[PDB]
Amino acid sequence: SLSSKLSVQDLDLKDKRVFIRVDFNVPLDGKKITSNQRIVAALPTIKYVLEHHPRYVVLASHLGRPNGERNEKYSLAPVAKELQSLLGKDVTFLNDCVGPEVEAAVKASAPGSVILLENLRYHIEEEGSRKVDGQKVKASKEDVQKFRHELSSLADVYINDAFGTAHRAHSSMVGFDLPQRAAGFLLEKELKYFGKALENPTRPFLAILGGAKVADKIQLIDNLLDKVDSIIIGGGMAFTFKKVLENTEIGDSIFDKAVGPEIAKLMEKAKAKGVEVVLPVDFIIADAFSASANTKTVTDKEGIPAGWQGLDNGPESRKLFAATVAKATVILWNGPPGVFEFEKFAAGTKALLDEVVKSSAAGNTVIIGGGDTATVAKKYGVTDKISHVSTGGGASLELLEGKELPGVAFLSEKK
Ligand SMILES: Nc1ncnc2c1ncn2[C@@H]1O[C@H](COP(=O)(O)OP(=O)(O)OP(=O)(O)O)[C@@H](O)[C@H]1O
Numbered sequence: 249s250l251s252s253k254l255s256v257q258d259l260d261l262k263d264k265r266v267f268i269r270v271d272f273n274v275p276l277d278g279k280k281i282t283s284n285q286r287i288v289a290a291l292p293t294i295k296y297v298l299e300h301h302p303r304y305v306v307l308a309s310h311l312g313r314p315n316g317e318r319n320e321k322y323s324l325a326p327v328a329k330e331l332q333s334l335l336g337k338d339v340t341f342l343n344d345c346v347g348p349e350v351e352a353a354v355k356a357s358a359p360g361s362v363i364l365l366e367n368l369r370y371h372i373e374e375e376g377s378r379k380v381d382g383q384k385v386k387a388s389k390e391d392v393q394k395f396r397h398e399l400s401s402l403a404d405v406y407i408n409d410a411f412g413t414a415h416r417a418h419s420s421m422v423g424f425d426l427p428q429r430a431a432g433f434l435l436e437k438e439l440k441y442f443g444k445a446l447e448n449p450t451r452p453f454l455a456i457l458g459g460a461k462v463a464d465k466i467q468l469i470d471n472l473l474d475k476v477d478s479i480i481i482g483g484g485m486a487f488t489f490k491k492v493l494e495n496t497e498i499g500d501s502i503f504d505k506a507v508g509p510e511i512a513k514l515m516e517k518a519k520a521k522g523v524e525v526v527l528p529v530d531f532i533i534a535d536a537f538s539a540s541a542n543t544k545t546v547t548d549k550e551g552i553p554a555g556w557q558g559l560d561n562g563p564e565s566r567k568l569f570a571a572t573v574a575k576a577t578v579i580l581w582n583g584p585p586g587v588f589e590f591e592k593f594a595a596g597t598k599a600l601l602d603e604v605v606k607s608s609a610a611g612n613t614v615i616i617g618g619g620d621t622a623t624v625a626k627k628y629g630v631t632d633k634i635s636h637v638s639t640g641g642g643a644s645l646e647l648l649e650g651k652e653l654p655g656v657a658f659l660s661e662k663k
């Protein structure tokens with residue numbers, strides 16, 4: 249989608265004014281912020297800048313869905329605490345926009361770090377349309393125009409360091425008129441890690457995608473679909489169908505009805521574009537979809553207990569996966585090998601997970617991140633992760649995919 253060499257650790261600052269759109273979203277107990285994972289990242293940019301000696305340092309919010317009621321408190325007082333503790337320099341939380349008080353505060357107290365906003369000022373969104381159900385309405389133009397003007401209001405250089413403004417727009421990624429587009433190391437890492445497989449990386453581009461089911465499932469497919477190294481490990485029932493015939497025929501009949509043409513089709517292009525897509529042949533299937541009463545065999549035999557096929561990546565599947573796994577190429581992993589969360593029908597899967605991460609070094613760098621996999625990662629244990637956990641399980645992917653990426657576009661290379 250682009251993101252060549254935007255900018256990082258490039259901004260010189262120096263008695264300059266810095267506004268940072270970070271990753272400030274956490275649980276919601278009292279204040280007791282359950283999880284500091286998101287906050288930790290902020291630190292490289294946050295600290296570097298925090299002290300460099302600008303004069304500013306406004307680090308924006310973003311965590312919650314102030315649905316029905318208004319701007320409702322449940323702000324970020326505790327977080328400041330988190331910030332204060334880490335920094336030990338003093339963090340002040342004011343307004344996400346203005347407040348006569350707002351313009352005043354930033355200016356007043358020399359160098360500091362101010363965390364303000366989120367999506368309280370229904371202005372960082374685009375109101376919950378569809379009439380009936382929940383009140384208010386989408387739409388809105390200039391009013392937003394003012395908010396944006398107001399927001400930039402006290403800045404110099406704006407640094408995005410979250411996977412938000414790369415699909416949509418939303419506050420902290422647009423309005424912030426005035427040049428200077430600086431992207432935290434985090435953004436930088438993705439683009440770079442993420443960015444190149446995209447370029448001309450020799451080390452093949454060896455591609456690992458588990459489980460069937462599409463959604464952009466399908467969406468996922470086309471973009472992942474174009475690349476470099478023609479190695480994709482995708483496990484689908486029809487493909488199986490497409491590939492041969494009988495497996496599908498007794499197995500059953502239908503996968504993703506649309507997916508059937510598209511899949512055979514995309515798949516074809518894939519051969520042409522690169523070469524090889526690696527599927528099962530050995531699968532394990534059990535009475536229901538759940539996790540109980542299970543059978544593992546290779547290939548042929550399905551029907552009643554099914555109508556799509558078996559489920560989790562089994563022995564055969566494991567090896568091949570592992571098999572390709574061992575073989576340079578970069579390794580990108582989206583969703584579960586399958587149903588990785590229903591033990592029994594989530595074993596081989598870990599098996600795959602291990603080499604990739606392990607390899608990262610050996611083999612080659614590993615970029616896997618999302619939601620489903622994320623779980624996979626946490627449960628198995630990233631432990632060295634060695635590549636990319638591309639948070640924005642979804643956002644990244646589309647992103648991953650090659651689309652333009654909105655937030656990202658805003659970024660150029662400082663200037
Ligand atoms: N062979 C399979 N047997 C059973 N369930 C499967 C199988 N393959 C895939 N699934 C389902 O597909 C999911 C795999 O993850 P999925 O394909 O949804 O990843 P993704 O689309 O890249 O990311 P996501 O889960 O956030 O947004 C499993 O969690 C499971 O619900």
Ligand SMILES: [Mg+2]
Pocket residue numbers: 619620
């Ligand atoms: Mg999911």
